[PDB]
Design a protein around this ligand. Structure first.
Ligand SMILES: Nc1nc2c(ncn2[C@@H]2O[C@H](COP(=O)(O)OP(=O)(O)OP(=O)(O)O)[C@@H](O)[C@H]2O)c(=O)[nH]1
Ligand SMILES: Nc1nc2c(ncn2[C@@H]2O[C@H](COP(=O)(O)OP(=O)(O)O)[C@@H](O)[C@H]2O)c(=O)[nH]1
Ligand SMILES: CCOc1ccc(C2=Nn3c(nnc3-c3ccccc3OC)SC2)cc1
Ligand SMILES: [Ca+2]
Ligand SMILES: [Ca+2]
Ligand SMILES: [Mg+2]
Ligand SMILES: [Mg+2]
Lengths: 54, 282, 422, 438
């Protein structure tokens, strides 16, 4: 025994429902993440340029 | 040259199977965590069925059926039979069982020979409930002579990737093999093992697997499956076979290891991976 | 537009560098004068990767020739494809290296190292998107080995975000010129570990065994050994020069083939090394064979971290995929299990000259440790008696610097052994 | 009428978008130059197709989509393609060098540079909307651009457009069709980041499509064209309710209401049928019941898994073609008596059905044959966690040895993000186990 409910029909087509059985970070916080990673790149590169200078 | 891995050291049966594969010279054993394999002898608990059949250019095969735990568990077997239209409550070969953690009020209604047994034996209901499924204990079993003793029958069943049910001709009786047991029936009860007992056995085995077939079948899956089962039966004085339990990873008789494990390779392994009958098909 | 600045240094590097430009000019249909005379548009779709377009629609190779003596570079200019190279890109000294790494990296080499960078920088300003740098040299010499590593260190200082790629040629007792070759090699490897991203180990011992045992050449010359390299370099840079379904930009090659920043030494392989056409399973079997390895290392003595293979020519792409997956499944004991699908394969539709189809092999195998071990045994054998060190100490070097190179290389070997037992 | 904006990130997102917008123009009868003879209201209008198309005075129907990729080589093919007159030049955003299969390089390094430009270009189309619903993001788990930049883009879209829903069309990495080996790395990282920004994500395993194009289309080595033209059919069936008059899934809100009971669990298992080869001359047109039963076949799913051992939470059936309500319900009754359909105890065992009278359109000269009826099932099965299990296992193999990690740390990213992203996935798999597994 199934039941069809909410049957709506339109030129494009029709639709219904059949039942069988009842039962965020802000803009600032994101900028901090990006600038912290960019700064670590500059640090790792600075240690490289320092190592080469040595 | 096919490949296979081993992920179950406690396996007594597949210890011989893996031994025969290395004796063919066409099967190579790899590491237990090596994804590039053709055959898998996985473990019993929490087998990764999800990572099977996802390797390019590799037809993978596993020695277990996913979803077969509904038949190899105590509470599941009782639930499977009572909730299946092809089995239902009116099941002739299955004893009266009840799941207790449920079916507590249902058990006391059928309680009012009145001896039961709980497992996962006493005539009184109160004791049983206090200990803790509850099955109707067969108070009148078949007794062998001489000895006046109780026994049971073990049958090994192998189901390949094509879901063909194969029954091993050589069974055992944990009181004795078929050849000795067949002679006893013809001399005491004037009947054969084929007709009196084995017929009902082939019925129980076939009915259980066909019931759970569309739930565990690997016909249209990305990986095939096969599994060796161990059915345990019980015979009363009226020569009627009752189903007790089904084992997922059963053992085999000592003298039958050589014959049975060889058969597994032939119809469940070589059928998928050919190289360069002892089973009764149902 | 992904442009690569090619650099060849020293006698060896220039001679094998010239042969490299010979083949790819033939593949891209470029006559010795520098004009285009091909037949397909696929030869010019990615021609800007190695070639600079001139005024009269010509294609001048983006390459820089470096040496401390004009003896080798004048041979290239007087060669078959010598009038195609840019006249200003010929930077050479007069003194020479004298098979000395010290003279090439500290004294004589440093007097010319800035003259090269002035050409390097000029070739970089015309790049819409500088891909990286390709160096071709040997490690048993002085110019290519000493000044070569110096250029790498100098370029990395100026271009820290550009990929460094080298074609280092390994010295061997069989094919040797001097006795100080292990000294130069050890001092070069230490530099390649810290300042490069990719390095193709090309052993002359392997190049000799191929010519002698496989090619049946009773007396192999340098010109014969260069052919193996020239065909190998053609296969490696196939996807880089020809439009593929993988879009190669060199940087991806570094990210995929190099799991650890110190383990980036690859093993080149080529097949075939005849009129009878080879089939797909035949090319694949030879491609992983030890007789086609150009690093003199047995793949069965180690395990493959990453594997890249390229197939050129018209062939059943399905069958190719099968044979590749076949090797991985028949030899799963030589591939690490902690790197899923560590074997990728692409197919080029344009075959090289002379062959209707070929296959080039690149593998970061841990068996490459034997290559560094062989050098370490030859190094310590001489260094324990301080032999031939007066050629180096007289250039301002100390024994401490040699010891550091010995330790740094032995530690490298320990790393390859570390992941081999994983 | 409420408009929607599509976003195509990375090579995978763009090329797939090409197959969809091509199919979109064929369904609405829109010529490549942008003209639409069917549309009588020139310059304006608020019909069902105006949600994905904008109109100019010349009568050109400009798609509401933005293509973004760190390399121009992919989008340049669209600039000189057949539909070069269809898109506005400001909709196609290209950078210099790509992410080179690196999540960190596309999320932190290069992504930071071009994120402000993209949002400004998205704002351009956002101002042309009287009532913007949300966004449709097309990307891949494997690519450094489709994972790195997408994760960053999805964060900013939750800031500049908080009251807007965002649906995804991600592409699960497969070994058969792959470009890198660090794709499991990129996959986990973009999942951990976008999990708190995505309302509903439809995963499409490349392995499935690859095996579907081999089994049904009889193609040995399927190209991206064959893959995209097939994926477009699925996307078209899902977005059909948005582009055409309907009552089911009319907006980007109902997709979350009808398929996503739990926010974290927003990965519906899509299944399409039938897939018919064009080269076939004589074919039997499958009936309504036959294609509905095929939805419960693993060989027709977008992700290879076994829904039988998983529990459903919500299911939707989208029909296109000659389909009547009588035959649909007749099929559902039959399936229940053969298939192991198990729903959770806290949800109604039922099906939401939508029917479109217009038959599925196919690309002329393609590899898909014209059908009279089809169906695309949207089921939120807990057995889709197998996709995460496989992926996370390949993650654990490499990360246990710390392989390829330095390529991510060298781009500014910290090693702690790996463990953070992994412990999040371990919590995700635990959720699926608490729902489906008894
Ligand atoms: N279905 C489909 N999948 C694709 C397509 N292109 C790429 N992929 C998948 O996406 C994965 C990575 O490729 P992309 O996501 O496109 O990488 P990208 O967008 O170019 O970004 P980069 O990493 O910077 O190169 C591959 O492993 C493929 O499986 C496509 O056109 N169609
Ligand atoms: N394969 C190959 N190796 C060479 C060639 N010329 C020199 N070599 C190697 O390079 C070493 C000699 O160093 P060399 O390159 O001449 O010194 P440099 O160029 O001045 O730095 C020897 O060990 C040779 O094995 C060549 O043409 N081909
Ligand atoms: C094992 C890890 O997975 C990988 C994924 C992608 C690649 C790429 N190939 N590539 C490049 N440049 N030269 C090559 C190459 C070199 C030799 C042979 C075959 C090649 O590929 C056509 S760029 C990226 C490599 C390995
Ligand atoms: Ca001087
Ligand atoms: Ca209109
Ligand atoms: Mg010399
Ligand atoms: Mg790309």
């Amino acid at each position: 025994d199934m039941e069809v409910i909410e049957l709506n029909k339109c030129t494009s087509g029709q639709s219904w429902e059949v039942i069988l059985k009842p039962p965020d970070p802000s803009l600032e916080e994101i900028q901090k993440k990006l600038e912290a990673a960019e700064e670590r790149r500059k640090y790792q590169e600075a240690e490289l340029l320092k190592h080469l200078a040595e | 040259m096919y490949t296979f891995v081993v992920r179950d050291e406690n396996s007594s049966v597949y210890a011989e199977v893996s031994r025969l594969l290395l004796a063919t010279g066409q099967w190579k054993r790899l590491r237990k965590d090596n994804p590039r394999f053709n055959l898998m002898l996985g473990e019993r608990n929490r087998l990764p069925f999800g990572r099977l059949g996802h390797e390019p250019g590799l037809v993978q095969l596993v020695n277990y059926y996913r979803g077969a735990d509904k038949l190899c568990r105590k509470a599941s077997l009782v639930k499977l039979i009572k909730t299946s239209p092809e089995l239902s409550e009116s099941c002739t070969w299955f004893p009266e069982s009840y799941v207790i953690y449920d079916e507590r009020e249902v058990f006391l209604a059928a309680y009012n020979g009145n001896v039961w047994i709980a497992k996962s034996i006493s005539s009184e209901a109160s004791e049983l409930l206090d200990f803790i499924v509850i099955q109707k204990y067969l108070e009148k079993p078949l007794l062998l002579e001489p000895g006046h003793r109780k026994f049971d029958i073990r049958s090994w069943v192998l189901v390949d990737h094509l879901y063909n049910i194969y029954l091993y001709r050589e069974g055992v009786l944990r009181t004795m093999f078929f050849e000795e047991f067949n002679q006893y029936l013809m001399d005491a009860l004037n009947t054969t093992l084929e007709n009196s007992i084995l017929l009902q056995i082939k019925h129980i085995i076939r009915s259980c697997l066909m019931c759970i077939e569309p739930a565990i079948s690997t016909k249209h899956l990305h990986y095939q499956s096969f599994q060796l089962f161990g059915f345990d039966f019980m015979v009363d004085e009226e020569l009627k076979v009752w189903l007790i339990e089904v084992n997922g990873a059963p053992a085999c008789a000592q003298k039958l290891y050589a014959e049975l494990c060889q058969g597994i390779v032939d119809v469940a392994i070589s059928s998928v991976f050919p190289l360069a009958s002892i089973f009764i098909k149902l | 537009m992904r442009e690569i600045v090619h650099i060849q240094a020293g006698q060896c590097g220039n001679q094998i560098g010239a042969k490299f430009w010979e083949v790819i000019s033939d593949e891209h249909g470029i006559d010795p004068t520098g004009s285009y005379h091909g037949d397909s548009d696929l030869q010019l779709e990615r021609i800007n990767v190695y070639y600079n377009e001139a005024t009269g629609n010509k294609y001048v190779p983006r390459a820089i020739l470096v040496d401390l003596e004009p003896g080798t570079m004048d041979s290239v200019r007087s060669g078959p494809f010598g009038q195609i190279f840019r006249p200003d890109n010929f930077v050479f000294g007069q003194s020479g290296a004298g098979n000395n790494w010290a003279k090439g990296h500290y004294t004589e080499g440093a007097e010319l190292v800035d003259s090269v960078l002035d050409v390097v920088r000029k070739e970089s300003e015309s790049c819409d998107c500088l891909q990286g740098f390709q160096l071709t040299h040997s490690l048993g010499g002085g110019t290519g080995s000493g000044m070569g590593t110096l250029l790498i260190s100098k370029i990395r200082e100026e271009y820290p975000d550009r990929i460094m790629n080298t074609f280092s040629v390994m010295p061997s007792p069989k094919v040797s010129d001097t006795v100080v070759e292990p000294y130069n090699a050890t001092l070069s490897v230490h530099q390649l570990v810290e300042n490069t991203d990719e390095t193709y180990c090309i052993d002359n011992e392997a190049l000799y065994d191929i010519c002698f045992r496989t090619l049946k050449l009773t007396t192999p010359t340098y010109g014969d050994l260069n052919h193996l390299v020239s065909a190998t370099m053609s296969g490696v840079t196939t996807c880089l020069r020809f439009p593929g379904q993988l879009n190669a930009d060199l940087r991806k090659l570094a990210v995929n083939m190099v799991p650890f920043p110190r383990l980036h030494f690859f093993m080149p392989g080529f097949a075939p090394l005849q009129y009878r056409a080879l089939t797909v399973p035949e090319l694949t079997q030879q491609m992983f064979d030890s007789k086609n390895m150009m690093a003199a290392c047995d793949p069965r003595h180690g395990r493959y971290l990453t594997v890249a293979a390229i197939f050129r020519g018209r062939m059943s792409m399905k069958e190719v995929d099968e044979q590749m997956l076949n090797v991985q499944n028949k030899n799963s004991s030589y591939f690490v299990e902690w790197i899923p699908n560590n074997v990728k394969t692409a197919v080029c539709d344009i075959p090289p000259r002379g062959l209707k189809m070929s296959a080039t092999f690149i593998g970061n195998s841990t068996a490459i440790q034997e290559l560094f071990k062989r050098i370490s045994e030859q190094f310590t054998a001489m260094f324990r008696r301080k032999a031939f060190l007066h050629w180096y100490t007289g250039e301002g070097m100390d024994e401490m610097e040699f010891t550091e190179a010995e330790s740094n290389m032995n530690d490298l070997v320990s790393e390859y052994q570390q992941y081999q037992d994983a | 009428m409420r408009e929607c904006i599509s976003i195509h990130v990375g090579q995978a997102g763009v090329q797939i978008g090409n197959a969809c917008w091509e199919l979109y123009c064929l369904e609405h009868g829109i010529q490549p130059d942008g003209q639409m003879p069917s549309d009588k209201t020139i310059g304006g209008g608020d019909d069902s197709f105006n949600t994905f198309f904008s109109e100019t005075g010349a009568g050109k129907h400009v798609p509401r989509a933005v293509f973004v990729d760190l390399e121009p080589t992919v989008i340049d093919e669209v600039r000189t393609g057949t539909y070069r007159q269809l898109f506005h030049p400001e909709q196609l955003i290209t950078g210099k060098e790509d992410a080179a299969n690196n999540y960190a390089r596309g999320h932190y390094t290069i992504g930071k540079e071009i994120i402000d430009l993209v949002l400004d270009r998205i704002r351009k189309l956002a101002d042309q909307c009287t009532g913007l619903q949300g966004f449709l993001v097309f990307h891949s788990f494997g690519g450094g651009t489709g994972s790195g930049f997408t994760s960053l883009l999805m964060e900013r879209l939750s800031v500049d457009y908080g009251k807007k829903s965002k649906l995804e069309f991600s592409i699960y990495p497969a070994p058969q069709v792959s470009t890198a080996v660090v794709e499991p790395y990129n996959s986990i990282l973009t999942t951990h980041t976008t999990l708190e920004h995505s309302d509903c994500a439809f995963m499409v395993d490349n392995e499935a499509i690859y095996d579907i194009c081999r089994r049904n289309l009889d193609i040995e080595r399927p190209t991206y064209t064959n893959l995209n033209r097939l994926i477009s059919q699925i996307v078209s069936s899902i977005t059909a309710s948005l582009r055409f008059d309907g009552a089911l899934n009319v907006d980007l809100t109902e997709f979350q209401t009808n398929l996503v009971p739990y926010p974290r669990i927003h990965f519906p298992l899509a299944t399409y049928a039938p897939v018919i080869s064009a080269e076939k001359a004589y074919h039997e047109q499958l009936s309504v019941a036959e294609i509905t039963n095929a939805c419960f076949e693993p060989a027709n799913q977008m992700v290879k898994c076994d829904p039988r051992h998983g529990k459903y939470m919500a299911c939707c059936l989208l029909y296109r073609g000659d389909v009547v309500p009588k035959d649909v319900n007749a099929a559902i009754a039959t399936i229940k008596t053969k298939r192991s359909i198990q729903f959770v105890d806290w949800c109604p065992t039922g099906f939401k059905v939508g029917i479109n009278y217009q038959p599925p359109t196919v690309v002329p000269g393609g590899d898909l044959a014209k059908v009279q009826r089809a169906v695309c099932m949207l089921s939120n099965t807990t057995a889709i966690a197998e996709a995460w299990a496989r992926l996370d296992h390949k993650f654990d193999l490499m990360y246990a040895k710390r392989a390829f990690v330095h390529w991510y740390v060298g781009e500014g990213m910290e090693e702690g993000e790996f463990s953070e992203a992994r412990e999040d996935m371990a919590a995700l798999e635990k959720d699926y186990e608490e729902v489906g597994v008894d």
